[PDB]
Amino acid sequence: RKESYAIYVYKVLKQVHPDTGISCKAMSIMNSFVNDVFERIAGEASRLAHYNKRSTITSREIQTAVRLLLPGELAKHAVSEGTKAVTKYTSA
DNA sequence: GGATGTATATATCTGACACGTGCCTGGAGACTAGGAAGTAATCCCCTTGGCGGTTAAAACGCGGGGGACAGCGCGTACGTGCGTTTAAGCGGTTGCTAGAGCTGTCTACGACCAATTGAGCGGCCTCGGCACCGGGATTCTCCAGGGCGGC
């Protein structure tokens, strides 16, 4: 009961590299990275909601936080990823 | 004798004080639930002062040469100044649209709560692969017999 991100990072690793392992320190670094990106995007979306006098955080605020924080092709590819995930989640 | 410098008085300009009003946001009073303080138990990590042994890192000394720094020359590129151009800055036209603010209505979306159950965490059993032990096949070193030579 430690509430980590290790199993999902492991499944993503088996998606991109099915025959590659990962050490415990590298897994801790990946968990810290996911937590850092989560709190950056959530803080930017919270600030965006407060700037526009909105009481809710929607996918638009998350999208704007992604386009604000992520640079270059990372931003547009993450927008395409999140957009098609939201489209798949809505239709079904 | 005429006009100029200077002092006191009066009207006007301007920042500041108080009065008035709305309104809406903070304060007063009451109630309630849960966040956090406190308590006890268990277990593992950290503290302080020691010992022993390995060993690789740290320290010290010394020679030498590479590099930092100073000086000098030179030539070029930037500062300085002036005359000319040009465009910024201001004021102005003329319509339309974007956007803030306010009011109003409504609806879909998210909070909330109860029941459920299935994905996450731990252990247990098994397989894939690596490794330990016993047995069979192949090649290397050696001891002895036969033949020849000498007195």
DSSP characters for chain A?
----SHHHHHHHHHHH-TT----HHHHHHHHHHHHHHHHHHHHHHHHHHHHTT-S---HHHHHHHHHHHS-THHHHHHHHHHHHHHHHHH--
**What kind of experiment solved this structure?**
cryo-EM
Write out the two tokens for A54: 């909105």
Whose C1' is closest to the CA of A7: which nucleotide? B120
State how far the Cα of A58 lies from the Cα of A69, in Å rounded to an integer.
17
CA(A61)–C1'(B151) in Å? 125
CA(A21)–C1'(B33) in Å? 50
Q: Resolution of the coordinates in A?
A: 2.6
Angle of helix A24-51 versus helix A59-69 axis, rounded to 10: 110
State how far the Cα of A26 lies from the Cα of A10, in Å rounded to an integer.
11
Half-sphere exposure of A43 (CA within 13 A, CB side): 7
Return positions of chain B under 7 A from a protein CB. Answer: 110-111, 120-122
State how far the Cα of A36 lies from the Cα of A59, in Å rounded to an integer.
19
Write out the two tokens for A30: 């990946």
Q: Which residues in 19-78 of chain A line strand B, with CB less than 7 A from it? A: 56, 58
